[PDB]
């Protein structure tokens, strides 16, 4: 089946989320489409490269193997899946 | 036979699970699943070169655990 954090990450598409890479890079952008394997496709991403240097990249795609965390916006806090 | 079934049949045993990143939690293991998830109560956790803190409840994952330490009063013939 599908997990409840997986469903929360799939329902968070279209809003401004922030994924975290395994090397310490945090990319914040609008999640266009998500997958069940934590594949985060985000537009207008802001890469940090673990040094604070935030560069503006377009159409970024981070895989689920390096995705350490996914900060979702507070608009999805009242979702019925989390109850 | 898999070794997860021997670890799942353990309740109210004061074990010591040493994690991968220099962490060691000694406590009474209250729950074990097929994915080696160890849920313990009233445990003491000591990290790498840190002070041993005490927690009322802890839930360590299977992939994060490196080794386990069982007491001497535990037969292995009946658990296998």
């Amino acid at each position: 089946s599908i997990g409840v954090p997986i469903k929360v990450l799939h329902e968070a598409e279209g809003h401004i989320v922030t994924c975290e890479t395994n090397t310490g890079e945090v990319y914040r952008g609008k999640l266009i489409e998500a997958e069940d394997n934590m594949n985060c496709q985000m537009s207008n991403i802001t890469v940090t490269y673990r040094d604070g240097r935030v560069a503006q990249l377009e159409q970024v795609y981070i895989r689920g193997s390096k995705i350490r965390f996914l900060i979702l916006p507070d608009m999805l806090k009242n979702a019925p899946m989390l109850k | 036979m898999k070794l997860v079934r021997f670890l799942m049949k353990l309740s109210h045993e004061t074990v010591t699970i040493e994690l991968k990143n220099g962490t060691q939690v000694h406590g009474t293991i209250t729950g074990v699943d097929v994915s080696m998830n160890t849920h313990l109560k009233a445990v003491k956790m000591t990290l790498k070169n840190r002070e041993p803190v005490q927690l009322e409840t802890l839930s360590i994952r299977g992939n994060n655990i490196r080794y386990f330490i069982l007491p001497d009063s535990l037969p292995l013939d009946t658990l296998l």
Partner: protein, 82 residues
């Protein structure tokens, strides 16, 4: 069993693999050790790198955080559900 669902929606602190600790209200979980922490705050310890410097911990709040099971090490309860 259902030992992971007994501590749901409570103020729990999960220790990461890099040494950080994320404290938040873990409302949703899954079989892949994932966690949905509402109003989460991540605290990471910094090295002193000196002889007289102390060890500090920088804490930053992120809100709703979806933490995967590949980075989570151990989770402990810290506070009751408000």
């Amino acid at each position: 069993s259902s030992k992971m669902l007994q501590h749901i929606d409570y103020r729990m602190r999960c220790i990461l693999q890099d040494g950080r600790i994320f404290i938040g209200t873990f409302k949703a979980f899954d079989k892949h050790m994932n966690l949905i922490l509402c109003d989460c705050d991540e605290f990471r310890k910094i090295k002193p790198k000196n002889s007289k410097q102390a060890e500090r911990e920088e804490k930053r709040v992120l809100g709703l955080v979806l933490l995967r099971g590949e980075n989570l090490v151990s989770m402990t309860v810290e506070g009751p559900p408000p």
